[PDB]
Amino acid sequence: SMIDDDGYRPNVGIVICNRQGQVMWARRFGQHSWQFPQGGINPGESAEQAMYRELFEEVGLSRKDVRILASTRNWLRYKLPKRLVRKPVCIGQKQKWFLLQLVSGDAEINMQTSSTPEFDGWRWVSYWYPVRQVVSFKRDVYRRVMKEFASVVMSLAA
Ligand SMILES: [Mg+2]
Ligand SMILES: [Mg+2]
């Protein structure tokens, strides 16, 4: 997507949960680092539309396979380490986050449809596992996201 005048790229992130107090955790393509799905917002796209596009592209899912349970109100920002900053220059992402419950079967997820996948694949992890496990520069954002979505996911686990 197009970079704003502050160097931040508008971005959507996706936390997909089940009814067992678990969230979908995905392995970055060709790496041993893991994250939640995230993607850019195209010009003319709403955040929700961008979310469903990134859901289709890299998780293989339809609106019909999920239900939106929550979203974050404003932008959550992270800055890249100086080493990872590659005209115009992107220094980080400003993110809107969505909590989805997977209602279709696990077999509906397909992370291998792109010629260059974001992810190798995924597994279910315990709810709080992502906070300690994501790359450190995203940890502050992840902590806030997971805190905001906490009450909803724990209700399904009961
Ligand atoms: Mg992505
Ligand atoms: Mg993507």
Curated annotation (Swiss-Prot):
Coiled coil location: none
Knockout-associated phenotype: Altered 5'-processing of primary pre-tRNA transcripts with short (<5 nucleotides) leaders; in the presence of the truncated inactive allele encoded by rph in strains derived from K12 W1485, including strains MG1655 and W3110. In the presence of wild-type (catalytically active) RNase PH no effect on processing. No effect on growth rate, a slightly stronger effect is seen when combined with the inactive rph allele.
GO MF annotations in UniProt: hydrolase activity, acting on acid anhydrides, in phosphorus-containing anhydrides; magnesium ion binding; mRNA 5'-diphosphatase activity; RNA NAD-cap (NMN-forming) hydrolase activity
Gene Ontology annotations of biological process type: mRNA catabolic process; NAD-cap decapping; RNA decapping; RNA destabilization; tRNA processing
Function: Master regulator of 5'-end-dependent mRNA decay. Accelerates the degradation of transcripts by removing pyrophosphate from the 5'-end of triphosphorylated RNA, leading to a more labile monophosphorylated state that can stimulate subsequent ribonuclease cleavage. Preferentially hydrolyzes diadenosine penta-phosphate with ATP as one of the reaction products. Also able to hydrolyze diadenosine hexa- and tetra-phosphate. Has no activity on diadenosine tri-phosphate, ADP-ribose, NADH and UDP-glucose.
Annotated family: Belongs to the Nudix hydrolase family. RppH subfamily.
Protein name stated in the entry: RNA pyrophosphohydrolase
Organism lineage string: Bacteria, Pseudomonadati, Pseudomonadota, Gammaproteobacteria, Enterobacterales
